């Protein structure tokens, strides 16, 4: 008893008559490539991807972004072609390349990464640590604006917070400094959330440091709501993740429901859902920057 | 009874002490490297000009065959067999000095 | 599994097969087994044009089966005036092309004879040869 | 639909002497010469040059040169045939002996009653005669020569239609082995022409596309 194959059968397309005239995989590598290409397509039979939890597979993204930066492509293409012409025709770079001596200027790479491609890497790195699932719950924001968060560990020593890096509660015992660039028409709101580690309520988080109504780069000049609270993980549970968020606001907003007492030591006073918060202020608030750090129990 | 000449001769065994040394300056090394790269480029161009040549030739051949077949079919019957002339073909390469 | 719609996804061996006569039809003329004898004096030169022939043949979609080297014919030449003895070496390579048509022959011959190197001799034959 | 059948034959003269090299091919030749002399293990002349030269000094404190001399003087005793048998004449485009390096082709002048015709050889082929047979026949006939012509195949090179009636010019390839030309001074005007000359001397467009299946070299 035979059934009828449903649509395509993997090798059906190639003609077995006269096998000598078909090109071959001479390289194990070519075979490897074609193989993975096939493994990525959605076949009509039971496959590895199906049973192993592809994280829902296809998902139709709710994108709350800061609108994509407007650029003319012909300009870019030409300027790049020319930059390449200037760079390649130099005999210095050829002599240097042949003899295996060259260095790439990491700082400038950091500048270009920031300018172009980085904001996209941010998206999937946040996706990796799931900065999306717990906060905006379905929604993806592309991190348009560069966000530099830093803790001072000494007079001369600065600890950077990169998205995904590991930091100790000792360096987080003090308030951070922030760098991002805007002229003054600007209105900003910045947030630091502890995404896991809520003891009573698994789906709730701890707002640590919340700041509102910021012109330009001036952090001291923004009205603060939650004064800074050093991360307080549990001895047992490892590696909590902490999210730094940025929002643009159109008109200056003041919200009394969010206001907290000045010393504010009590834990139940800080209970948070980024979801509800963003529901409250949604129309005036657009999500901008993202920087997160991962921290585990320490002596302090 | 096949025997190839690919064998390295036994005569060459102990005579090996004659030409060991090699040393190059960065000037000669670079001189040969530049000439090498230029060479590879050059050849890649040249193969392309010859392939273009033979391709254009065979296109002229196509025009030919198609025309001659369409006009008179007796010629598609005549011309398509490969005659006995090609069996004993002997061509000898160019010389340095003519007769 | 025979009953399932997916029976034979695993099927391969028809894809790789692990297991003469010229055809003259008067229209489609397949001449099998053309033997090309390159007789050149220099090892380097013989290797050069042999390699070149094979290389081109690969590109032309023309099938090449066996490229081998025939035994070196050493002609010891006695120079008669007083005697002089100059040892001399003839080298032969063979490129056997398994199929061809009249038109691709017409094309083939041109590239061959045109691109012949200095002091290079060519002989085109049929597959019956013995070693 | 009357078809006036006219064969035509492209005549190929084999290049005799080797062509000179591009400046780059020269530089590359130099490079390969150097590296090939570098990878080379011993020599008989060199073993017996160096070992003897070092042993003689040791015999004095306690051949290769003669060979070199004999070789030099014997190479100087040998006078070689000139590579240019053409540009010394410089005139005859009608000489078969002209271009040793290149491939040459035959070309003829014909003034007919209603037409001024410059003919890359043209054969009128009767429908009964094979294209082959007519090509060869008109070849040996017109030039008034004994020609051993090695034709590649029964396949024709290129085909061109001058349509009034309709009429076909069918072009073929003959590789000339040994020409024997009777009375080189007979009035039929024939030209022995290279690629550059074939470009210029060919007025018709049917021939202007015959230089398209020409083999450049």
XYZ file of C-alpha atoms in Angstrom:
747
model
C 0.000 0.000 0.000
C 1.528 3.302 -1.143
C 0.431 6.836 -0.300
C 0.847 9.847 -2.578
C 3.872 12.049 -1.765
C 2.734 15.540 -0.756
C 4.284 18.138 -3.035
C 8.066 18.041 -3.601
C 10.213 14.937 -3.004
C 13.744 16.131 -2.140
C 15.713 14.787 -5.130
C 12.879 14.761 -7.714
C 14.293 17.736 -9.653
C 17.537 16.254 -10.999
C 17.739 14.126 -14.150
C 19.284 10.706 -13.508
C 19.572 9.932 -17.228
C 23.185 10.615 -18.309
C 24.776 11.165 -14.879
C 28.108 12.193 -16.377
C 26.805 15.563 -17.570
C 25.628 16.742 -14.183
C 28.075 18.891 -12.236
C 29.233 17.440 -8.899
C 30.234 18.449 -5.410
C 33.971 18.100 -5.679
C 34.340 19.678 -2.239
C 33.053 18.294 1.056
C 32.512 21.977 1.910
C 30.074 22.642 -0.967
C 28.082 19.657 0.157
C 28.046 21.065 3.692
C 26.664 24.421 2.479
C 23.926 22.951 0.284
C 23.009 20.651 3.155
C 22.451 23.506 5.638
C 20.546 25.454 2.951
C 18.175 22.513 2.752
C 17.973 22.106 6.532
C 16.707 25.712 6.816
C 13.712 25.363 4.428
C 10.254 24.383 5.822
C 9.739 20.767 4.585
C 6.343 19.022 4.522
C 7.424 16.080 6.722
C 8.298 15.779 10.443
C 11.567 17.631 10.963
C 14.006 18.624 13.731
C 12.837 22.232 13.840
C 9.233 21.162 14.370
C 9.627 19.202 17.603
C 12.446 21.203 19.169
C 10.838 24.495 20.021
C 11.879 27.141 17.531
C 10.401 29.805 19.869
C 7.048 29.891 18.032
C 8.778 29.959 14.644
C 7.021 32.668 12.600
C 5.861 35.611 14.717
C 4.272 38.784 13.384
C 6.185 41.515 15.132
C 4.596 44.374 16.945
C 7.238 46.934 16.187
C 7.268 49.979 18.369
C 10.263 51.772 16.942
C 11.844 55.100 16.518
C 11.237 55.481 12.757
C 14.060 54.252 10.438
C 16.698 56.940 9.664
C 16.136 58.472 6.208
C 19.038 58.051 3.768
C 19.576 58.280 -0.005
C 21.319 55.114 -1.258
C 23.040 56.366 -4.420
C 25.079 58.831 -2.342
C 26.191 56.070 0.042
C 27.033 53.654 -2.798
C 29.124 56.230 -4.648
C 30.964 57.561 -1.571
C 31.746 53.967 -0.589
C 32.968 53.004 -4.084
C 35.274 56.023 -3.989
C 36.487 55.292 -0.450
C 37.336 51.790 -1.687
C 39.176 53.216 -4.711
C 41.256 55.515 -2.506
C 41.988 52.752 0.020
C 42.918 49.977 -2.418
C 45.170 51.887 -4.847
C 47.603 52.774 -2.033
C 50.876 50.788 -2.240
C 51.348 51.045 1.528
C 48.312 48.850 2.222
C 49.365 46.290 -0.409
C 52.965 45.976 0.840
C 51.639 45.765 4.401
C 48.940 43.206 3.592
C 51.271 40.816 1.715
C 53.686 40.617 4.678
C 50.892 39.998 7.213
C 51.336 43.263 9.122
C 48.232 45.371 9.655
C 45.969 46.485 12.479
C 42.326 47.433 12.483
C 41.553 50.552 14.586
C 39.019 49.117 17.069
C 37.743 52.545 18.176
C 36.746 53.581 14.657
C 35.124 50.157 14.194
C 33.150 50.903 17.355
C 32.129 54.246 15.831
C 30.891 52.649 12.580
C 29.208 49.781 14.412
C 27.406 52.399 16.478
C 26.474 54.467 13.400
C 25.123 51.677 11.175
C 24.944 47.993 12.034
C 25.105 47.930 15.830
C 21.494 49.015 16.494
C 20.438 45.850 14.640
C 22.758 43.570 16.635
C 21.285 45.121 19.760
C 17.875 43.824 18.701
C 18.872 40.168 18.521
C 21.131 40.364 21.567
C 18.151 41.657 23.549
C 16.124 38.879 21.941
C 18.735 36.423 23.148
C 18.445 37.399 26.792
C 14.734 37.915 26.223
C 14.618 41.592 27.133
C 11.455 41.607 24.999
C 9.325 38.754 26.404
C 9.187 40.006 29.995
C 8.937 43.755 29.309
C 6.982 44.616 26.162
C 5.611 41.043 26.010
C 5.132 40.705 22.245
C 6.875 43.722 20.968
C 10.204 44.584 19.376
C 11.790 48.017 19.524
C 14.894 48.684 17.484
C 17.501 50.480 19.632
C 18.034 53.605 17.494
C 19.835 55.811 20.020
C 23.291 54.908 21.516
C 23.175 54.471 25.325
C 26.288 54.557 27.515
C 25.746 53.490 31.145
C 28.750 53.484 33.505
C 29.502 52.771 37.182
C 32.459 54.412 38.941
C 34.489 51.764 40.798
C 37.208 54.177 41.853
C 38.504 57.686 41.247
C 40.178 56.598 37.992
C 38.143 53.450 37.249
C 35.092 53.198 35.064
C 33.029 50.043 34.679
C 31.081 50.030 31.386
C 27.631 48.444 31.066
C 27.428 46.724 27.703
C 24.356 44.833 26.650
C 25.013 41.261 27.871
C 28.040 41.896 30.129
C 28.533 40.554 33.694
C 28.807 43.122 36.532
C 29.243 42.750 40.353
C 26.819 44.289 42.948
C 29.875 46.061 44.403
C 30.179 48.384 41.396
C 26.399 48.802 41.371
C 26.407 50.041 45.000
C 26.746 53.564 43.555
C 24.657 55.526 41.049
C 25.611 55.302 37.314
C 26.389 58.066 34.766
C 24.756 58.184 31.323
C 25.842 59.404 27.880
C 23.675 59.929 24.795
C 23.383 62.915 22.454
C 20.481 65.289 21.841
C 20.103 69.068 21.312
C 17.690 70.951 23.517
C 14.190 70.662 22.299
C 14.532 67.309 23.957
C 12.346 65.419 26.430
C 13.486 62.042 27.796
C 12.551 59.326 30.296
C 15.062 56.705 31.489
C 14.440 53.432 33.360
C 16.422 50.727 35.150
C 14.483 47.517 35.791
C 15.338 44.210 37.453
C 13.636 41.737 35.111
C 13.754 38.695 37.399
C 14.241 38.139 41.107
C 10.852 39.291 42.326
C 10.153 37.068 45.288
C 6.375 37.265 45.651
C 5.270 37.703 42.035
C 7.129 35.816 39.223
C 5.690 38.106 36.482
C 6.597 41.317 38.268
C 9.866 43.262 38.298
C 11.689 45.783 40.539
C 12.101 49.344 39.312
C 15.494 50.298 40.693
C 16.205 53.702 39.256
C 13.508 55.751 37.462
C 14.086 59.224 35.955
C 11.624 61.544 34.152
C 11.553 64.781 32.087
C 15.089 65.165 30.836
C 16.196 67.907 28.447
C 19.100 66.804 26.216
C 21.950 65.062 28.041
C 21.239 66.541 31.468
C 20.551 63.756 33.947
C 20.849 65.774 37.176
C 18.247 68.186 35.754
C 15.576 65.521 35.160
C 13.025 64.960 37.927
C 13.800 61.658 39.625
C 11.054 59.351 40.859
C 12.825 56.306 42.245
C 16.146 57.209 43.807
C 18.921 54.716 43.013
C 18.773 51.266 44.623
C 21.801 48.899 44.356
C 20.945 45.433 42.846
C 19.990 42.952 45.542
C 20.105 39.436 44.048
C 19.677 36.277 46.135
C 22.647 34.160 47.214
C 21.270 31.061 45.533
C 19.574 32.236 42.355
C 22.184 33.057 39.760
C 22.611 35.803 37.192
C 19.704 38.237 37.191
C 19.444 40.615 34.201
C 19.020 44.406 34.486
C 17.531 46.583 31.725
C 18.241 50.234 30.909
C 15.473 51.765 28.776
C 15.052 55.175 27.059
C 11.835 56.845 25.879
C 11.155 60.006 23.928
C 8.259 62.124 25.121
C 6.578 64.896 23.145
C 5.055 67.122 25.838
C 6.471 67.137 29.387
C 4.547 64.532 31.365
C 3.997 64.345 35.104
C 2.487 61.244 36.692
C 1.626 61.085 40.392
C 0.719 57.379 40.453
C 4.342 56.575 39.621
C 5.831 58.936 42.243
C 7.552 57.179 45.171
C 8.647 58.265 48.681
C 12.151 59.779 48.824
C 14.082 57.179 50.907
C 11.821 54.309 49.653
C 13.452 51.213 51.223
C 10.347 48.964 51.204
C 10.260 46.279 48.469
C 6.501 46.077 47.885
C 6.608 49.793 47.095
C 8.670 48.869 44.042
C 6.562 46.482 41.975
C 6.493 46.987 38.271
C 5.143 45.970 34.916
C 6.760 47.712 31.967
C 3.618 46.690 30.107
C 1.135 48.668 32.268
C 3.533 51.610 32.591
C 3.844 51.880 28.812
C 0.042 51.468 28.507
C -0.381 54.513 30.768
C 2.015 56.780 28.864
C 1.844 55.100 25.432
C 0.865 57.951 23.089
C 3.557 60.362 24.315
C 6.224 57.709 24.899
C 8.418 56.073 22.212
C 11.047 53.469 23.262
C 14.602 54.393 22.196
C 17.796 53.044 23.800
C 18.595 49.671 25.371
C 21.538 48.568 27.573
C 21.442 45.542 29.923
C 23.857 43.888 32.391
C 23.876 40.472 34.080
C 24.665 40.241 37.801
C 24.965 37.495 40.458
C 25.253 37.351 44.269
C 28.259 39.040 45.849
C 29.438 39.905 49.384
C 27.933 43.423 49.549
C 53.509 -3.444 -20.321
C 53.294 0.181 -19.071
C 56.381 1.928 -17.656
C 56.282 5.710 -17.112
C 59.320 8.016 -16.908
C 58.090 9.857 -13.746
C 60.807 8.092 -11.679
C 63.499 10.369 -10.234
C 66.810 8.925 -11.658
C 69.257 7.141 -9.366
C 72.095 9.264 -10.863
C 70.833 12.328 -9.027
C 71.201 10.831 -5.513
C 74.586 12.070 -4.174
C 75.091 14.897 -6.690
C 72.618 16.903 -4.547
C 75.255 19.005 -2.743
C 75.737 21.454 -5.668
C 72.802 23.910 -5.446
C 71.585 24.393 -1.818
C 71.675 28.168 -1.146
C 68.930 30.781 -1.602
C 68.657 34.313 -0.207
C 66.388 37.151 -1.312
C 66.213 40.881 -0.466
C 62.802 42.503 0.076
C 63.457 44.232 -3.253
C 63.702 41.009 -5.308
C 60.981 39.286 -3.280
C 58.585 42.196 -3.866
C 59.712 42.398 -7.503
C 58.627 38.777 -8.013
C 55.421 39.177 -5.972
C 54.226 42.169 -8.031
C 55.040 40.382 -11.299
C 53.190 37.328 -9.991
C 49.964 39.207 -9.149
C 50.113 41.106 -12.434
C 50.596 37.760 -14.192
C 47.498 36.154 -12.641
C 45.419 39.216 -13.605
C 46.836 39.127 -17.144
C 46.048 35.442 -17.691
C 42.518 35.886 -16.335
C 41.986 38.590 -18.963
C 43.597 36.550 -21.772
C 41.501 33.423 -21.174
C 38.481 35.686 -21.380
C 39.561 37.135 -24.739
C 40.140 33.648 -26.179
C 36.836 32.342 -24.787
C 35.124 35.381 -26.282
C 36.840 34.558 -29.591
C 35.756 30.903 -29.729
C 32.253 31.778 -28.476
C 31.764 34.385 -31.229
C 33.101 31.791 -33.683
C 30.515 29.198 -32.605
C 27.800 31.871 -32.811
C 28.784 32.433 -36.456
C 28.602 28.641 -36.786
C 25.032 28.645 -35.385
C 23.911 31.365 -37.817
C 25.467 29.305 -40.600
C 23.991 25.888 -39.695
C 20.529 27.303 -39.081
C 20.426 29.226 -42.387
C 21.742 26.324 -44.469
C 19.323 23.849 -42.830
C 16.269 26.081 -43.241
C 16.929 27.015 -46.874
C 17.894 23.545 -48.217
C 17.276 20.375 -46.100
C 19.517 18.278 -48.383
C 22.306 20.329 -46.812
C 21.229 19.412 -43.248
C 21.484 15.841 -44.586
C 24.898 16.400 -46.210
C 26.816 18.525 -43.776
C 25.974 16.817 -40.437
C 28.036 13.645 -40.946
C 31.709 13.933 -39.958
C 33.765 12.743 -42.925
C 36.729 10.241 -43.002
C 39.230 13.158 -43.474
C 39.617 13.851 -39.736
C 41.029 10.409 -38.835
C 44.747 10.784 -39.800
C 45.297 14.429 -38.720
C 48.895 15.505 -38.164
C 49.786 19.090 -37.343
C 53.291 20.275 -36.487
C 53.988 23.341 -34.375
C 55.776 26.526 -35.494
C 59.568 26.627 -35.724
C 62.127 29.205 -34.651
C 63.972 29.389 -37.992
C 62.338 28.765 -41.406
C 63.988 26.669 -44.229
C 8.641 2.974 5.576
C 6.665 1.670 2.600
C 3.178 2.758 3.667
C 4.109 6.359 4.558
C 3.953 9.265 2.073
C 7.645 9.855 2.769
C 8.917 6.474 1.620
C 12.253 6.872 -0.158
C 13.576 10.140 1.229
C 16.630 8.034 2.017
C 16.908 6.808 -1.556
C 20.332 7.663 -3.041
C 22.247 5.033 -5.095
C 20.471 5.867 -8.364
C 22.188 9.282 -7.963
C 25.756 7.964 -7.921
C 26.464 5.018 -10.176
C 29.185 2.654 -9.029
C 29.069 -0.425 -11.248
C 34.134 1.342 -27.748
C 31.683 2.549 -30.409
C 31.469 5.817 -32.373
C 27.839 6.671 -33.323
C 27.310 8.090 -36.824
C 23.615 8.716 -37.479
C 24.155 11.142 -40.391
C 22.533 14.051 -38.498
C 23.603 13.584 -34.909
C 27.154 12.367 -35.291
C 28.743 11.145 -32.094
C 32.281 10.083 -32.637
C 33.516 8.232 -29.633
C 37.069 7.576 -28.536
C 39.300 10.153 -30.235
C 42.922 9.682 -29.193
C 45.184 12.752 -29.175
C 48.931 12.133 -29.285
C 51.111 15.039 -28.228
C 54.684 14.365 -29.297
C 56.985 17.089 -28.002
C 60.691 17.191 -27.255
C 60.771 18.982 -23.885
C 59.321 17.501 -20.688
C 58.279 20.962 -19.530
C 56.835 21.767 -22.961
C 54.997 18.453 -23.360
C 53.565 18.853 -19.834
C 52.564 22.429 -20.680
C 50.534 21.737 -23.780
C 49.173 18.418 -22.480
C 47.944 20.202 -19.362
C 46.561 22.971 -21.535
C 44.632 20.582 -23.779
C 43.147 18.790 -20.789
C 42.316 22.102 -19.074
C 40.512 23.445 -22.131
C 38.689 20.152 -22.726
C 37.310 20.370 -19.201
C 35.842 23.808 -19.899
C 34.413 22.835 -23.300
C 32.040 20.278 -21.668
C 33.866 17.663 -23.769
C 34.454 14.438 -21.819
C 38.063 13.505 -21.078
C 38.594 9.987 -19.756
C 42.198 8.858 -19.571
C 45.176 11.184 -19.721
C 48.334 9.107 -19.497
C 52.008 9.258 -20.445
C 53.372 6.847 -23.076
C 56.887 5.332 -22.767
C 59.734 7.708 -23.602
C 61.460 6.940 -26.900
C 65.166 7.569 -26.446
C 66.899 7.905 -29.780
C 70.637 7.703 -29.331
C 72.026 9.674 -32.259
C 75.442 8.678 -33.568
C 76.849 11.749 -35.286
C 79.016 10.681 -38.205
C 81.486 13.045 -39.853
C 85.051 10.971 -35.930
C 82.139 10.060 -33.626
C 79.854 12.214 -31.480
C 77.247 10.860 -29.060
C 74.290 13.007 -28.042
C 71.606 11.335 -25.920
C 68.152 12.575 -26.915
C 64.700 12.277 -25.384
C 61.247 12.187 -27.031
C 58.236 12.588 -24.724
C 54.654 11.586 -25.457
C 51.433 12.359 -23.623
C 47.980 11.079 -24.457
C 44.630 12.812 -24.033
C 41.656 10.532 -24.768
C 38.386 12.370 -25.408
C 35.429 9.943 -25.214
C 32.909 11.843 -27.312
C 32.654 14.580 -29.916
C 30.382 15.926 -32.697
C 31.310 17.274 -36.174
C 30.743 20.931 -35.220
C 32.639 20.774 -31.908
C 35.399 19.066 -33.959
C 35.474 21.991 -36.367
C 35.750 24.310 -33.353
C 38.220 22.067 -31.495
C 40.775 21.802 -34.297
C 41.179 25.592 -34.599
C 42.005 26.178 -30.924
C 44.302 23.169 -30.979
C 46.508 23.946 -33.989
C 46.461 27.731 -33.373
C 47.642 27.483 -29.783
C 50.353 24.949 -30.582
C 53.663 25.805 -28.877
C 57.043 26.020 -30.648
C 58.368 22.534 -31.409
C 55.116 20.698 -30.579
C 53.712 17.862 -32.738
C 50.103 16.673 -32.818
C 48.493 13.390 -33.857
C 44.744 12.705 -33.720
C 43.722 9.043 -33.938
C 41.168 6.425 -32.899
C 41.124 4.470 -29.657
C 42.743 1.231 -30.849
C 46.232 1.486 -29.401
C 48.281 -0.955 -27.360
C 50.718 -0.566 -24.488
C 11.712 30.086 -54.459
C 14.762 29.696 -56.739
C 18.016 29.117 -54.820
C 21.265 30.068 -56.550
C 23.859 27.969 -54.796
C 27.295 29.458 -54.319
C 29.970 27.854 -52.180
C 32.925 29.835 -50.888
C 36.119 28.764 -49.184
C 38.216 30.379 -46.458
C 41.842 29.447 -47.204
C 44.077 28.970 -44.195
C 47.835 29.353 -44.519
C 49.636 27.838 -41.489
C 51.873 30.176 -39.410
C 55.522 29.048 -39.754
C 57.860 31.059 -37.487
C 56.977 31.764 -33.805
C 55.749 35.231 -32.795
C 57.753 37.565 -30.464
C 56.634 38.187 -26.840
C 54.763 41.034 -25.098
C 56.946 43.032 -22.615
C 55.016 41.372 -19.756
C 55.456 37.848 -21.153
C 59.131 38.810 -21.355
C 59.301 39.786 -17.673
C 57.439 36.572 -16.771
C 59.836 34.562 -18.955
C 62.732 36.145 -17.040
C 61.136 35.252 -13.693
C 60.524 31.637 -14.686
C 64.043 31.308 -16.126
C 65.555 32.502 -12.843
C 63.380 30.277 -10.624
C 63.891 27.260 -12.879
C 67.679 27.658 -12.758
C 67.260 28.017 -8.956
C 65.365 24.730 -8.254
C 67.890 22.820 -10.364
C 70.038 20.194 -8.627
C 73.727 19.977 -9.680
C 74.760 19.671 -13.360
C 77.281 17.363 -15.036
C 79.074 20.320 -16.620
C 78.828 22.162 -13.279
C 79.911 19.275 -11.029
C 82.891 18.705 -13.296
C 83.450 22.486 -13.439
C 83.446 23.205 -9.703
C 84.957 19.988 -8.333
C 87.760 20.151 -10.926
C 88.344 23.885 -10.376
C 88.639 23.276 -6.608
C 90.821 20.157 -7.031
C 93.302 21.834 -9.419
C 94.020 24.654 -6.945
C 94.623 21.948 -4.310
C 96.999 20.124 -6.685
C 98.894 23.382 -7.315
C 99.217 24.375 -3.636
C 100.318 20.824 -2.699
C 87.655 21.048 -18.957
C 84.575 23.276 -18.454
C 86.326 26.332 -19.907
C 87.381 24.504 -23.106
C 83.827 23.216 -23.495
C 82.487 26.778 -23.109
C 84.945 28.067 -25.744
C 84.130 25.331 -28.280
C 80.404 25.929 -27.724
C 80.709 29.706 -28.179
C 82.767 29.527 -31.386
C 80.567 26.734 -32.830
C 77.433 28.790 -32.073
C 79.046 31.786 -33.806
C 79.989 29.612 -36.811
C 76.281 28.942 -37.351
C 74.351 31.398 -39.512
C 70.546 31.281 -39.262
C 67.669 31.954 -41.674
C 66.171 35.444 -41.341
C 62.823 35.600 -39.530
C 61.490 38.335 -41.812
C 61.079 37.141 -45.409
C 58.193 39.641 -45.840
C 59.015 43.178 -44.680
C 62.293 43.056 -46.658
C 60.166 42.769 -49.792
C 57.569 44.927 -48.011
C 55.582 45.108 -51.225
C 54.155 41.755 -52.224
C 50.845 41.188 -50.543
C 50.485 38.594 -53.304
C 53.375 36.397 -52.143
C 52.526 33.148 -50.342
C 55.882 33.230 -48.557
C 55.131 36.597 -46.947
C 54.018 36.345 -43.284
C 55.852 33.587 -41.379
C 54.397 34.411 -37.935
C 50.726 34.880 -38.865
C 47.985 32.945 -40.634
C 47.241 34.007 -44.209
C 44.231 33.867 -46.523
C 43.766 33.968 -50.347
C 41.852 36.779 -52.082
C 41.102 37.514 -55.773
C 39.989 40.330 -58.112
C 37.093 39.820 -60.568
C 35.332 42.439 -62.703
C 32.178 40.974 -64.247
C 29.837 42.571 -66.784
C 27.280 44.115 -64.446
C 29.370 43.969 -61.276
C 32.684 44.996 -59.767
C 33.570 42.030 -57.523
C 36.339 41.554 -54.973
C 36.236 37.826 -54.312
C 37.326 35.889 -51.279
C 37.215 32.671 -53.264
C 33.702 31.918 -54.459
C 32.464 28.667 -55.950
C 29.185 28.090 -57.784
C 27.950 24.757 -56.456
C 25.546 22.659 -58.492
C 22.830 21.035 -56.289
C 24.125 17.622 -57.457
C 27.690 18.331 -56.317
C 28.368 18.117 -52.575
C 29.418 21.423 -50.949
C 32.726 19.666 -50.224
C 33.367 18.562 -53.827
C 32.564 21.986 -55.307
C 34.757 23.746 -52.739
C 37.768 21.512 -53.518
C 37.186 21.499 -57.293
C 36.961 25.296 -57.632
C 39.912 25.559 -55.233
C 42.348 23.442 -57.309
C 40.938 24.818 -60.603
C 40.964 28.598 -60.004
C 44.446 29.042 -58.458
C 45.974 26.805 -61.164
C 48.102 25.147 -58.529
C 48.865 21.759 -57.013
C 47.528 22.097 -53.506
C 47.426 19.488 -50.804
C 44.619 20.902 -48.697
C 43.681 19.294 -45.414
C 40.020 20.067 -44.821
C 38.838 19.690 -41.240
C 35.374 18.182 -41.787
C 32.188 17.783 -43.834
C 30.792 20.668 -41.799
C 30.702 24.203 -43.384
C 32.010 27.257 -41.444
C 29.610 30.104 -42.214
C 26.627 30.903 -44.422
C 25.516 34.181 -46.018
C 22.499 35.111 -48.156
C 22.454 37.750 -50.887
C 18.757 37.792 -51.763
C 17.196 39.157 -54.956
C 15.420 34.729 -56.221
C 17.472 34.046 -53.123
C 21.109 32.979 -53.155
C 23.487 31.473 -50.611
C 27.235 31.886 -49.961
C 28.507 28.888 -47.980
C 31.951 29.254 -46.416
C 34.372 26.412 -45.607
C 37.803 25.847 -44.081
C 40.840 24.512 -45.892
C 44.130 24.091 -44.055
C 46.846 24.202 -46.732
C 49.644 21.641 -46.472
C 51.883 22.036 -49.544
C 51.190 24.614 -52.254
C 52.651 24.206 -55.732
C 51.714 27.330 -57.677
C 51.930 27.309 -61.491
C 52.899 30.658 -63.088
C 52.754 33.152 -60.183
C 52.642 35.881 -62.853
C 49.314 34.828 -64.403
C 46.890 37.767 -64.660
C 44.269 36.594 -62.145
C 44.949 38.954 -59.259
C 45.375 37.077 -55.997
C 46.398 38.505 -52.624
C 47.986 36.729 -49.651
C 46.623 38.589 -46.694
C 46.934 38.678 -42.895
C 44.236 39.648 -40.367
C 44.973 43.377 -40.608
C 44.974 43.138 -44.420
C 41.754 41.071 -44.416
C 40.040 43.845 -42.512
C 40.907 46.448 -45.162
C 40.792 44.551 -48.462
C 37.300 43.113 -47.914
C 34.579 45.407 -49.244
C 31.448 43.187 -49.031
C 29.486 42.723 -45.797
C 29.159 38.967 -46.475
C 32.990 38.821 -46.278
C 33.040 41.451 -43.499
C 31.235 38.862 -41.377
C 33.585 36.173 -42.736
C 36.344 37.963 -40.857
C 34.052 37.241 -37.853
C 34.732 33.481 -37.926
C 38.394 34.327 -38.677
C 40.887 32.906 -36.146
C 42.786 35.873 -34.705
C 45.871 34.344 -33.040
